[PDB]
Amino acid sequence: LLHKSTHIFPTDFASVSRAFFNRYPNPYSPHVLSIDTISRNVDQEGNLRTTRLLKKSGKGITETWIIEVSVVNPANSTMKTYTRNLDHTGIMKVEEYTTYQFDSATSSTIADSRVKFSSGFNMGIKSKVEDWSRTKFDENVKKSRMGMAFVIQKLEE
Amino acid sequence: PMVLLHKSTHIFPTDFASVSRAFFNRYPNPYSPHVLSIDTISRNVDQEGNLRTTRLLKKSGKLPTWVKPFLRGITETWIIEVSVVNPANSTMKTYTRNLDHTGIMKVEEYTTYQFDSATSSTIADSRVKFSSGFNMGIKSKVEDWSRTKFDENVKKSRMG
Amino acid sequence: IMSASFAPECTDLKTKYDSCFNEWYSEKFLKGKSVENECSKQWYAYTTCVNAALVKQGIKPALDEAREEAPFE
Amino acid sequence: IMSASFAPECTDLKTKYDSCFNEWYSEKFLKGKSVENECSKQWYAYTTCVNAALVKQGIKPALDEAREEAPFE
Ligand SMILES: CCCCCCCCCCCC(=O)OC[C@H](COP(=O)([O-])O)OC(=O)CCCCCCCCCCC
């Protein structure tokens, strides 16, 4: 699930977009240990397709691998970016969709950001305790009911 | 807290009189080895005319070791079973849940007995509700952290 | 065997209270014929046996409280 | 201070490739002047270095799998 934040960069597209490619290293993300470009190319539509790999530190185990993927459209001044941890997804998977789009009438670059959190091991649980109850419920409702049947039958003999 | 409703129905080939009686004398029976004792804490007939009855029961159970260490030494529960019998419209309500251990979880069982004038049957409507000793807090507490920790991370990363 | 009371010393006074009840239930209460608790005796025996034992029972306070609630809202 | 590569032995190869790209990106690509790899030498030297280091990284399988997925669907 969600996280809807919006910001405006009073800068043009060529600036905001170059930045994204050279955001590291910077003082606000000291946790970013390294970033590598795994693949980059221009598709048949003239858009720059990129996928990068970053390793981030934080608080044996300790670090996380994040995949970065982006698409730059020089024809309409738009940049789509996606990021999600590669490991530890069983515990918590964090997805980030942030799009940069140039608006001419205000000469600024708008960034829209959506962040989804999703855990499977969590939900796996929500599902077991659920099944546990349906079971314990089903079993016992059967028994108790047959208890009443017996008790009723004999009480008629 | 966390709740899990469960409904299920059953129809008895006998009258309200026949079934109701069995309710009151359902113990012991083939599938009740876990029922240790049942007592009639209080009975009477209200202004309305129905039989109001409260019975304390004590059922036993064997906790799963692989998830039972934490909990101390406990192999049994006290349960209260309130009930009402309307001799007129031939119906009986029967609430019933645990008294001790409400800390961990709390089970409740509403079951109603209606006699179907036509089918010579007594229909029993069972609704069971599980809840939890716990849970009110964290996640919500926490979420919000995830909310702000990211409400800050986005804004923090933005600047850069 | 019969249904045990939580106090083994009442199991019996209990059985009896039960018997006269089933009789007054099926044969009187259920048939509109009800009249002046045909069992003061058996009940009192049993009900005072169980009340004695209950005070020593830690579960009592929890039971009393629960008796105040109306699960049938 | 330039951003390092997860593999120290490629940080320089990456620096040179990135520099080449930034120029190609801002002056060529965004101005509709080129859609080809005019940084081929820097890219191939750098990517050869990286992939060599990835073959020895436990995260490779996960990475390979993620590269087949299309997040923008
Ligand atoms: C952390 C553990 C907490 C346990 C709390 C259990 C509370 C149960 C409250 C509701 C009991 C009840 O009214 O449910 C009706 C059924 C009737 O079936 P039966 O007893 O006639 O076979 O009754 C049952 O069959 C359900 C209960 C059977 C198992 C009893 C386990 C007692 C607890 C053991 C661990 C302390």
Residue type, B153: N
- Residue A147 is encoded by which pair of tokens? 């208890």
Long-range contact pairs involving B101-104 (C-beta distance under 8 Å, separation at least 24): B101/B74, B101/B77, B102/B133, B103/B133, B104/B71, B104/B132, B104/B133, B104/B134
Contact across the interface for B24 and C22, Cβ inside 8 Å? yes
Taking CA–CA distances from A25, the nearest residue in chain B reads: B160
Per DSSP, the three-state class of D29 is helix
Q: d(Cα A132, Cα A28) in Å, to the nearest integer?
A: 46
- Contact between A118 and A91 under an 8 Å Cβ cutoff? The reply is no
Residue A90: list chain D partners with CB under 8 A: none
Distance C10 CA to ligand 1 centre (A): 24
Neighboring chain A residues of B10 at a CB cutoff of 8 Å: 141, 145
Residue among A111, A137, A155 whose CB faces B6 most closely: A137
For residue A41, give Cα distances in angstroms to A3, A70, A86, C31, D63: 30, 11, 22, 89, 18
Q: Are A15 and A120 in contact (CB under 8 A)?
A: no
Size of interface A-B (CB pairs under 8 A): 74
From B1's Cα to the closest Cα of chain C, the distance in A is 18
Strand arrangement of the beta sheet that strand A32-42 belongs to = A5-9, A108-118, A93-103, A78-85, A64-73, A48-56, A32-42
Distance from CA of A75 to the nearest CA of B (A): 25
Count of other CB atoms within 10 angstroms of residue C31: 11
Q: How far is residue B154 from each of residues A4, A23, B69, B79, measured CA to CA in Å?
A: 10, 14, 43, 52
Q: What angle do CA A138, A140, A143 make, to 5 degrees?
A: 115
Backbone region of residue C55 per phi and psi (left: phi > 0; alpha: psi in -120 to 50; beta: other values): alpha
Q: Is omega for the bond preceding A25 within 30 degrees of 0, making it cis? A: yes
- Distance between start and end Cα atoms, chain C: 37
CB contact set of B32 (below 8 Å; sequence gap of 6+): A143, A147, B26
Task: For residue C4, report the phi and psi dihedrals to the nearest 5 degrees.
Answer: -70, 145
CA–CA distance, A117 with A113 (Å, rounded to integer): 13
Method by which this entry was solved: X-ray
CA of B21 to the centre of ligand 1 (A): 22
Angle between helices A13-21 and D11-23 (to 10 degrees): 170
Cα C5 to Cα C15: distance, rounded to the nearest angstrom: 9
Using a CB-CB cut-off of 8 Å, the residues of chain C touching B56 are: 6, 59, 63
> What is the per-residue burial (b if ≥16 Cβ within 10 Å, else e) of C38-60?
ebeebbebbbebbeebbeeeebb
Beta-bridge mates of residue A42: A48
Chain B CA closest to residue C69: B82
Tell me which DSSP letter residue A85 carries.
Answer: E
The preferred substitution site among B93, B98, B110 for testing ligand 1, maximizing ligand atoms within 8 Å of CB, is B98
B97/C66 Cα distance (integer angstroms): 10
Q: CA A76, CA A109: separation in Å to the nearest integer?
A: 12
Counting the structural domains of chain C, the total is 1
Which value, to the nearest 10 degrees, does the dihedral of the CA atoms of residues A26, A27, A31, A36 take?
A: 10
Residues 6 or more apart whose CB falls under 8 angstroms from that of A3 comprise A113, A114, A115, A116, A117, B147, B150, B151, B154
Residue of A132, A135, A130, A125 lying closest to B8 (CA atoms):
A135
C-alpha distances in Å from residue B103, one per residue of B35, B100, B106, C48: 22, 8, 8, 31
> Which two structure tokens, joined as six digits, stand for B138?
């964290």
Question: Which residue, among A92, A67, A27, A54, has the nearest Cα to B150 in the 3D structure?
Answer: A92
Residue B109: strand pairing partners = B128
Domain that holds residue D13: 1-73
Q: How far apart are CA C27 and CA B59, in angstroms?
A: 31
Helix (H) or strand (E) holding B132: strand B121-132
Query: What's the reported resolution, in angstroms, to a tenth?
Result: 3.2
The C-alpha atoms of residue D59 and residue A38 are separated, in whole angstroms, by 13
Instruction: Write phi, then psi, for B7 (nearest 5 degrees).
Output: -115, 160
Residue type, B11: I
